[PDB]
Subunit: 131 residues, 3 copies
């Protein structure tokens, strides 16, 4: 079968938000899949996909680690402003769920950054079962 | 049909140029397609291609926006040293033409940077017509 | 035929190492292929692949240049902390070998960085012989 899925959201809101940031630029994103507000990504994709996150500079400090499914830790979108760090590929399980942790010190300053999350299907695995 | 096209030019000229910068490294680029001097890209590709631009840091200021076809604005190779910004995907029309605007303030300094422009065919769309 | 190869190693070693750095996170890498300790990449792949190296900032200086096969020089993983620089494509020969040169000054500082080396097979060439 061919699942033909792509997803890509962009953010360009005008000024100061009342809270957590949504997305208004559906650039291609037929099913929705990953809710980017809570970051709860259900991939049914089950092939090799091409992933690209946009990292906000924030030289002011604070450690950002996007938790990865099956192991915890495993910062794949890693920024230091059993466990491995990877950028290009994607050991993601079918139906499993990634979650962003943004809590690494409480003596911080208030700031709201802007984030772009693209992610397009490259290869859907075609059965690949032998006996 | 299979159009089997790739294009990728590179720049490694020795020193100070008399004007606008050409390309001597045809890395793979059978037809030529995009003239990178005037930046006039005719894509007959008409499927999904994988685009990667190389962004020169230039912290000194000046806003750089590569104009996109069909809408104007639409900075896809965006650097802030109807309208959306995208990096991974490519809504490009068949036969349409992209152009680089490099004019955002006239009280600037003279500098000549070096730029690498790759772009390879991933998927040619195979008819995809039903009735 | 279907060559079905992917390769990607990751590094998350705990602290201060006695020399050149190996890899403990085989994330997907069935044959192994490229030993990144000695940097001796044997591609039998013979196809167009998408390779991406992670560049350590190192603002302190020192010229980094990864030698490319068939020409010498030709820095493909280029960082300025007949010869061309390319990021996306790969004019690489079957069975030939790329090597990192890390020697551009002797009056420097001692440092150890951590490096992640991904590289995934996009297209295996399917004969493409006519007469």
């Amino acid at each position: 079968p061919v699942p033909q899925v792509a997803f890509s959201a962009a953010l360009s809101l005008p000024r100061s938000e009342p809270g957590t940031v949504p997305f208004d630029r559906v650039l291609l994103n037929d099913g929705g899949y990953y809710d980017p507000e809570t970051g709860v990504f259900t991939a049914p994709l089950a092939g090799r996909y091409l992933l690209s996150a946009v990292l906000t500079g924030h030289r002011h400090e604070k450690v950002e680690a996007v938790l990865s499914r099956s192991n915890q830790g495993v910062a794949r979108v890693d920024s230091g402003g059993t466990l491995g760090v990877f950028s290009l590929i994607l050991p993601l399980q079918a139906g499993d769920t990634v979650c962003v942790d943004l809590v690494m010190g409480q003596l911080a300053h208030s700031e709201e950054p802007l984030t772009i999350f693209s992610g397009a299907l490259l290869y859907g695995d075609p059965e690949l079962e032998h006996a």
